[PDB]
């Protein structure tokens, strides 16, 4: 089924047996990209692959920050990202602005993804090339993770995992215990199953952050590394 | 994988493997064109430009790759150069309406990740290309220190320590790969830069060239200057020299 | 002979990476007739070879040397259309200058501003670009002599003497061998006109006209057209040293 | 000078003498106001308010004279309580519609420059009044060190190490003229405000944090500490 | 201090000792309107209305001086009621823009601050006059609690464990002071209401009046409903009796 | 001439004898401001403003009636200071969408002519009031030299050597007079600014008093800066000393 003829040229274009094809082809634009995974406050890690030398420390960054409380963790086309999460900085401003306080995570996904289905439906353009992940906490609310894909698909998780291996990473976390377990502890465990998954960058927001989400010090990445490293020998 | 049909002739339209061709083409608009790298040293940063002498007939002081954009930021180019200078401006607009409002110079990282908004704002729709070119921005103030941003035509802003575009891309990053420019003075680095350029430079396909360079640093008081006679011409004999080996 | 698609389209890359309908805009000027221009120290002069294509014209009609301003002109190749549309273009925009800012537009500037313009029709669908190529001259005491390049895909370039059409090639060898950061107006005149009859075919194109242009210290900074001694007896001297 | 035939109705009209009287007036509107003041510390700046127990029936954590702008930036108000509000509106959206674009947090500097411009835009023009509210905004962080600035019906903004608007601007402001304030942590200024309120306070309080001491976070004064330094005032009163 | 001349007549126009009269004034046109008040159980909100049969004639359910707003906030308004109609269309609106969007009810907290805002909006201007009522707003969920307001002329959002607006405020928010309310349920609360409104009313002045009730809170699921007539009538004699 | 009865109530209005009233009031506010002064060096331009600390509590650089529009324009403004500001940001906007597009810095001659379009704008209409405030642009390049702009709220521009505006206008120019200050360096010149401040300072009736200072010249490169604190408090002594 390279299906296509006409009918994967457009997002203006149904197959006949009734898909997009344009979405789904946007979609192999974030398996073309490297492995990002995220877990439940909440975590976030990526295969962030050293493509030079030459370059900024805290440039590339494939962990954003979209406000205080909330983390954007992205894979596929970084452009795009980068211009979704501008998107979500203005939503949840124009939050503050008027309603007083914080963005709940629930509804902020449920807007920026509007916005990126906003780009499914249309002949004069393509859709988003790129998947990502919002993460917070705050009390009242508990810890929240959020995934939209490329088709503009908000889905509630536990824990999941974008790019190179969605698959393999998934089953990977099916493993753990993540309901139970503390932040401190699973930072370990995420870095475990990149290096894991990885073919031959680290996030926090918790009760253990105020609320803030910041990156993880280097202490904490350089020790979990270094665990990683050695339960990989085996 | 030529591929295209279809895929490759539309900004709108994703490959099936997951790829807007149309980008990658425009990137290949910069391979086209000659080489030209910007590199950090500690009170600055420095910009050069195999500028190609494509006639004697020539102004010096038009064909320039190396713009300012305010005082205090630099802009070098490379890839199709009429969509750079139309690019120039926007960052021009974008760092004045700035300053309308918010009072001082607007912050490098920044306006790149402002002005790359803009080109990738050209790489979703059908009704376009996107722009053929890439670009660095370099800028020193005390408060931010030195700073070096590239943006390429997918809308892509990277921070550096030191870059290069164009024809050799490949060649010229190893090489600076080699120099310790986190330590350096730009002073030495001019020197250093327009090494690079020879070196890279193809004395058999393309014919004679000149050359163009650019301060910003605590060196310049935070302007963004040409580089004065003197220090090109020293400079310039110094690569000559270290050529030949 | 690349196209397929690729070059259809001013929205369309090449795989190798090449906007393929501009470079087919470009070549609309080349099989357009050769118009030169060059700075002399004192000034800028432009001329034409432009070619009689019938008897029955009006005399200045045709022209393919305006006045964009008072102290500015214009000397175009290509699709002549086109041009005097640019032309139009660059008039508003050094008139929408002296409006607000007082005095004459730079020319460093006027130029840079009608390129943004003939760019904009590089990058879209549902036009286009501009099958035009053309040069401004200007002078002022403040700002000296100015000579600028546009083509198609919206390049300005300054230049000390260029050349646009038929032969681009050989008339530039030709400006090359002149020394004309030295010489003054006057003389220049001479040695355009020259250039053109030079480059000109006598076989494939027929009989020629000869077009051309002041502006300098020489004429108070108005660019005007050439008054016929100076023409008559500068076409005669390029004849002449022809036979050789 | 109850100037005035004509000359004090509208913003529109300068008296002959050259005076905006309808500013003036909208002034008056924030002396007619209970007082409130506010001080720097050297890590960080401090809000109090002279809150008038208008009613036992109220809700607590109503009232409020100070509030949030943002979470780095405090606001604390004084005469015409509506307009206040509206006003703190204008300076939310604009702290926001920063962060928006410029990615962190806005300079107190410049939030303050803007919402300016903004009070000042009502005092040219015949069809409005001019806002009847003083405030100041306060804000830390650690690049930007301590910051403190007030504006006025006019729309006037004044950096400031402290000041103090409404009932008495004059008794309050020479007390803190007395204070060390460039020296002291913020912690000792609570103390010191509260005492100056009860100073001023005709017989015949609301608090607030931001500094280091808080992270950057202007937050209200807890409990504990309020009380504590209420008592302090009490005490150093008595003399 | 019946100051005015020039200084009450506009919005638009501070008094010289610093006051917006115009405002001042329509907010005596609150207190020309008959009594009516609200009060927040521990389980609620409760509101009560004066309300002064003015015709035999009438429908019952017109006049009516409780609103639903949404399903979960009440309204309850004294002064000029043409003016409150129009201001619980507002509220109305900014309620259910909110559902539209932000998925859930709206908190009164914030529902207040809009509305507020918009009644402000009329105290700065010439070209009108400010709204001639105040209102309370009511609600109950369990995630944020009882929850009572009040908005006056002036554009202010009070917070409140009881309020009470019109001919006598001041009478009847005295009476409140007495109330326990934080302690008691809502079901206590409407016989206590119904009290102060027999205690504050005129006799003499007013002639017979009716009675309006309100309830919301977990007694009703949250759901902003009238009274049952069983706990009226009932509420309604126990006034009567405490009176004598 | 107290004229006025309507005359004077309305920038829209003409009295008879043929006069703007309620611009000439606004120019009074002007007057009840204090003094400023700027005046043109050889090699570029200085300013002084006798500014009244009117508190202890304040910043340091608060208050400051001495801006930069640019990096090479200085602005010094008397009167009305709110207005002041606002006006600052307009020659912000116009000096900087100067850069947008013209390239370099915006010329003085030119932005002083801008701004004062738009102070002259308030002067026509009923709706407004005009501008309660003057100021002084100064600046220097190479290529144009140093330079010295005044406006007041009636939208005029003006050329200077050097000028004062506020408390005494008069006496202060009248002392500028006496100066030399086409020949004198700008070094020199800061002092007999603070000499003149200090002159026309009332003792009595104002109270204490701070002083602020301004560069623009080749001195400082093009760049508008504060005088460093050696060169004040050099200066404010020699004022001091010559003085008595």
């Known amino acids: 089924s390279s299906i296509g003829t006409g009918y994967d040229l457009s997002?203006?274009?149904f197959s006949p047996d009734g898909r997009v094809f344009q979405v789904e082809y946007a979609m192999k634009a974030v398996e073309n990209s490297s492995t990002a995974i995220g877990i439940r406050g909440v975590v976030f890690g990526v295969e962030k692959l050293v493509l030079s030398k030459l370059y900024e420390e805290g440039s590339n960054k494939r962990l954003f920050n979209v406000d205080r409380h909330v983390g954007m963790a992205v894979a596929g086309l970084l452009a795009d990202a980068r211009s979704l999460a501008d998107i979500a900085r203005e939503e949840a401003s124009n939050f503050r602005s008027n309603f007083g306080y914080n963005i709940p995570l629930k509804h902020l996904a449920d807007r920026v993804a509007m916005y990126v289905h906003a780009y499914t439906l249309y002949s004069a353009v393509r859709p988003f090339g790129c998947s990502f992940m919002l993460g917070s906490y705050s009390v009242n609310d508990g810890a929240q993770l959020y995934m939209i894909d490329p088709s503009g698909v908000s889905y509630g998780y536990w824990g999941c995992a974008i790019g190179k291996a969605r698959q393999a990473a998934k089953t990977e976390?099916?493993?753990?215990?993540?309901k139970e377990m503390t932040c401190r502890d699973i930072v370990k465990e995420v870095a475990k199953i990149i290096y894991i998954v990885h073919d031959e960058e680290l996030s926090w927001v918790g009760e253990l952050t105020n609320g803030?989400?910041?990156?993880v010090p280097k202490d904490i990445r350089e020790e979990a590394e270094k665990y990683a490293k050695e339960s990989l020998k085996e």
Do not use: N, P, V, Y
Request: proline fraction near 0%; hydrophobic fraction near 40%.
């Open 173 to 178: 976390i099916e493993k753990l215990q993540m």
């Open 212 to 215: 803030r989400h910041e990156i």
């Open 11 to 13: 997002a203006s274009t």
